[PDB]
Amino acid sequence: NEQLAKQKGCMACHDLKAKKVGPAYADVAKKYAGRKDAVDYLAGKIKKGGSGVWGSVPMPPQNVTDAEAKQLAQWILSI
Amino acid sequence: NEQLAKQKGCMACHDLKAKKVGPAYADVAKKYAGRKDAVDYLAGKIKKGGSGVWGSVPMPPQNVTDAEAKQLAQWILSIK
Amino acid sequence: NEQLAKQKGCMACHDLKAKKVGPAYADVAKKYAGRKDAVDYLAGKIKKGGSGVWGSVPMPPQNVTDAEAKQLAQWILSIK
Amino acid sequence: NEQLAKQKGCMACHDLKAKKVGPAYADVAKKYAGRKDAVDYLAGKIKKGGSGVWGSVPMPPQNVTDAEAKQLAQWILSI
Ligand code: HEC
Numbered sequence: 151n152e153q154l155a156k157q158k159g160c161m162a163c164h165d166l167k168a169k170k171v172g173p174a175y176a177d178v179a180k181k182y183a184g185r186k187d188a189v190d191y192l193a194g195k196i197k198k199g200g201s202g203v204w205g206s207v208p209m210p211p212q213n214v215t216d217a218e219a220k221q222l223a224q225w226i227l228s229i
Numbered sequence: 230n231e232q233l234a235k236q237k238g239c240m241a242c243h244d245l246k247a248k249k250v251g252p253a254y255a256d257v258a259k260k261y262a263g264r265k266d267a268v269d270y271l272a273g274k275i276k277k278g279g280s281g282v283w284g285s286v287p288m289p290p291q292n293v294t295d296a297e298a299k300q301l302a303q304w305i306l307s308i309k
Numbered sequence: 310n311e312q313l314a315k316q317k318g319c320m321a322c323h324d325l326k327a328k329k330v331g332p333a334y335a336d337v338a339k340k341y342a343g344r345k346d347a348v349d350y351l352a353g354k355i356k357k358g359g360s361g362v363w364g365s366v367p368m369p370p371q372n373v374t375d376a377e378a379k380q381l382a383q384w385i386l387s388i389k
Numbered sequence: 390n391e392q393l394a395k396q397k398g399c400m401a402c403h404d405l406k407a408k409k410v411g412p413a414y415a416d417v418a419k420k421y422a423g424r425k426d427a428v429d430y431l432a433g434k435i436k437k438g439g440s441g442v443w444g445s446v447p448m449p450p451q452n453v454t455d456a457e458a459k460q461l462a463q464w465i466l467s468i
């Protein structure tokens with residue numbers, strides 16, 4: 151949920167609507183919602199980070215567990 | 230409010246009156262006093278950071294919600 | 310002390326009990342409780358940061374004097 | 390002063406004794422104290438940043454006035 155995103159520092163680089171560092175959470179939801187295994191995909195990206203999907207700036211790996219990454223993916227996709 | 234600003238780590242770089250890494254809060258309050266869109270303007274600056282208004286060193290973006298950014302903006306603008 | 314910790318920005322990444330970006334203070338206290346040289350060890354880590362103890366995310370170095378690092382270490386150790 | 394250094398965020402990368410990001414202040418004092426124009430030289434580096442003198446990691450420019458840069462240099466040199 152949003153409280154968890156805040157607790158894990160996600161909002162430093164992601165706003166719900168504005169572009170900061172990574173994509174707006176509302177934009178991620180638009181891209182992936184309804185797509186097969188969107189939750190599992192996004193959970194992996196949240197924990198491990200990555201580059202090249204939204205731009206050339208990498209997202210670093212994050213101090214989140216698998217269960218946390220899944221909760222955050224579920225929350226994001228619900229926007 | 231002040232405790233929120235301290236909790237978020239804003240005082241690592243800002244003081245009420247002293248010039249640290251970023252501008253004093255009182256100096257931000259003075260600069261934007263009376264501007265109709267000061268809260269919304271500063272809220273965005275608090276969320277996103279920025280450069281070039283006060284100096285050449287950029288402020289990093291901040292781990293805040295829209296509601297928190299609004300509260301911090303309102304608090305800052307209240308400083309005499 | 311807690312207020313120093315907040316002022317320096319430590320609470321941006323650490324909570325007393327919750328697991329944020331860095332380990333909870335209570336968990337640090339538990340791990341190093343009764344270890345001699347705990348204070349000197351944690352002071353070093355507060356000044357210099359590091360990684361690999363709690364996760365693969367590095368803690369950045371911190372804007373603290375050696376005296377402040379030792380104060381913050383002693384406060385963290387007391388969280389039990 | 391050590392108080393102005395902390396106030397300006399300098400201690401995040403510099404310790405008096407230990408190596409963090411930039412050189413320990415005690416080591417900078419050893420290299421420059423008693424050299425011609427050491428205050429002006431260091432003040433310029435403090436305000437404008439630089440790289441290659443102590444290693445390959447650049448120091449960024451700093452939000453300090455000229456007076457603050459010269460006071461910081463004088464303090465460092467006294468160590
Ligand atoms: C900067 C230091 C970041 C932090 C902290 C977090 N994120 Fe991130 N994120 C960032 C960038 C630059 C990008 C785009 C990477 C790219 O491939 O272009 C992202 C991306 C995401 C995504 C979408 C990934 C995808 O493959 O589509 C998600 C779902 C995401 N980020 C979530 C997220 C969470 C939950 C975070 C806190 C644990 C988090 N990010 C932190 C930059 C940064």
Ligand code: HEC
Binds near residue numbers: 234242279281288293
């Ligand atoms: C350094 C690591 C900072 C932290 C942490 C915070 N701020 Fe900041 N801030 C910093 C600088 C170097 C600047 C000047 C940027 C520039 O344009 O020259 C700022 C600026 C602000 C402002 C003024 C914005 C403007 O006038 O356009 C505000 C209102 C502000 N900062 C607030 C703020 C808050 C609430 C913070 C914690 C959530 C915060 N800052 C952290 C450096 C740093």
Ligand code: HEC
Binds near residue numbers: 314321322323360371
């Ligand atoms: C994120 C930008 C952080 C800030 C700001 C602070 N800390 Fe931190 N800390 C962070 C991480 C990611 C970790 C884990 C590092 C690892 O080894 O995996 C830590 C760790 C600590 C520790 C424990 C060190 C150890 O057991 O070896 C302590 C005692 C600690 N942090 C204290 C501390 C203080 C006092 C801070 C303000 C000066 C501070 N931290 C800021 C992330 C971040």
Ligand code: HEC
Binds near residue numbers: 451
């Ligand atoms: C990292 C984000 C830094 C901050 C903040 C400050 N300094 Fe720095 N400094 C840093 C590095 C990596 C280096 C070495 C650069 C190189 O050429 O190898 C330095 C260097 C200095 C020096 C010596 C300069 C020289 O010998 O040419 C001084 C005197 C110095 N730094 C002082 C200083 C002050 C006063 C700061 C706060 C205003 C400050 N530094 C911040 C990294 C970083």
